[PDB]
């Protein structure tokens, strides 16, 4: 089947959310470990988080996590890179979070009006960003981002992954 090893000391919440939103469509187990490895088959593994997300989104044609057309696919690519670069730097964070706020002003989900890898990726990255936490507790988080982030966090799949894996 599919097997994901994770770094138990620093879990990839994005990939785990994807495993969570995908488990009803493909058989996949999660193993404790010290790094992230998605074992696809004998000669096939993915080790970087965005590749792991892409692969899971692609084999789970029921969940619709890579969007429903080429343009939504491309938007999801945009957000995957946004979270891995801009949102991972915690450097010029204010400008980066303001870009994210602008994009969410007229959206409920980041892409195509339903949950996608974009949401999982950006959410997971945001949760692990110290500057985001320092913005929330200090009541300075931008309105739309707070609204969208709270929406996802109240979903049962997010609460389940949080409880099991999130190392406070």
């Amino acid at each position: 089947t599919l097997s994901l090893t994770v770094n138990s000391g620093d879990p990839p919440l994005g990939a785990l959310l994807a495993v969570e939103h995908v488990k009803d469509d493909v058989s996949i187990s999660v193993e404790e470990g010290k790094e992230n490895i998605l074992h696809v088959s004998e000669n096939v593994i993915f080790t970087d988080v965005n590749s792991i997300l892409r692969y899971l989104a692609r084999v789970a044609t029921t969940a619709g996590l890579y969007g429903s057309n080429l343009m939504e696919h491309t938007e999801i690519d945009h957000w995957l890179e946004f979270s891995a670069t801009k949102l991972s730097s915690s450097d010029s964070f204010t400008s980066t979070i303001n870009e994210l706020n602008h994009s969410l002003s007229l959206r409920t989900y980041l892409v195509g009006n339903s949950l996608s890898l974009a949401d999982l990726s950006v959410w997971a990255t945001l949760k692990g960003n110290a500057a985001w936490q320092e913005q929330l507790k200090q009541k300075k988080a931008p309105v739309h981002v707070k609204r969208w982030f709270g929406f996802l966090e109240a979903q049962q799949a997010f609460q389940s992954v949080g409880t099991k894996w999130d190392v406070s």
Partner: protein
């Protein structure tokens, strides 16, 4: 192939002239081989001057134009942006940032069908070009060469038997890496020459220097 699901026509790319996206130029030459493309270069008013080679990177524009005929419109705007950006006529699609993401989109227009594993491999190589090779240490670059050399001993192109966007982006990024000497392994050398032998690859590369 088909291209009319929601028919979009004009592709706009904002790029910084201090950092020309060679992968997009190569891609542009490639699209032109398959589609009737109308190509234009503007300079945004936020940019004072632009090198002549970059002003006319779509110079083989003297050709007679179908005019009625065009399948795709490709507008390159030299602009003071922190990151290469693609925009569409459509309000619903957000601006696409990053040449890797733009390259993925443009190459997809060729219709190449891939399975989950191989599509993801292709995406992986693009990420490696962007997150590791583009701005990595000398050691990070050496590790990329090693991975490429291993892969290229097993298939003629980075993801198998056919040219993919993986080859376009990694080759391009390699050409724009300039500062410190590092040495290229033999399977990578063979693959570079395979790339350079393709008209779209070398003409676009020539554009980058005066």
């Amino acid at each position: 192939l088909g291209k009319d699901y929601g028919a979009l026509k004009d592709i706009v790319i904002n790029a910084n002239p201090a950092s020309p996206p060679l992968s997009l130029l190569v891609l542009h030459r490639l699209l032109c081989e398959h589609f009737r493309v109308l190509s234009t270069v503007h300079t945004h008013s936020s940019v004072k001057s632009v090198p002549e080679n970059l002003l006319k990177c779509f110079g083989e524009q003297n050709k007679k134009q179908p005019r009625q005929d065009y399948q795709l419109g490709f507008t390159l705007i030299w602009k003071n942006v922190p990151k290469t950006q693609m925009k569409f006529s459509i309000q619903t699609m957000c601006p696409i940032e990053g040449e890797g993401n733009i390259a993925r989109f443009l190459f997809s227009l060729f219709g190449q069908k891939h399975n989950a594993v191989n599509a993801t491999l292709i995406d992986s190589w693009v990420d490696i070009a962007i997150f590791q090779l583009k701005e990595g240490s000398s050691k990070e670059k050496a590790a990329v060469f090693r991975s490429m050399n291993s892969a290229l001993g097993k298939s003629p192109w980075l993801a198998g038997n056919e040219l993919t966007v993986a080859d376009v982006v990694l080759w391009s990024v390699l050409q724009q890496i300039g500062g410190c000497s590092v040495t290229v392994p033999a399977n990578v050398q063979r693959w570079m020459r395979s790339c350079e032998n393709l008209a779209p690859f070398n003409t676009a590369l020539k554009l980058l220097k005066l």
